[PDB]
Amino acid sequence: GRFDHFVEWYIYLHKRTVSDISSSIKELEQQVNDLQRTVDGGMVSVKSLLEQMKFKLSEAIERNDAAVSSRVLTESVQK
């Protein structure tokens, strides 16, 4: 059995439990609001600075809807 895989998974679960859950989705969407300043009053072309997070948040939400619904369990519950 892949016990090293278990150790890595358990450590990842503890990292996602001790943090990233008290704030939840609080600071991740804050970067859009912060970078909107450079979008508005900075350079006309700014897509290269906001090309990944825009759909990263959407894919993170569509992956975490399992963790928030009656679906794939939360990290704390699995741990």
Next chain:
Amino acid sequence: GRFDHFVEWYIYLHKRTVSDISSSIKELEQQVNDLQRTVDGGMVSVKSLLEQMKFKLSEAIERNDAAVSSRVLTESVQK
């Protein structure tokens, strides 16, 4: 002889010839000039997690002095 090493080195030279450092350091300096002016008032959150590229600017300054001080040939000349 390591022909695979030659192929990697040759492709690297081709990329450095079609990219060069004259059109990469200036863009990094422009990004720094824009970001620093944007964060001039404060709210340095958009510079704390973007400090990585500001340090990679100096990292690009590194590994570059060796290319002019050691009298090494230009990538296009070597190719």
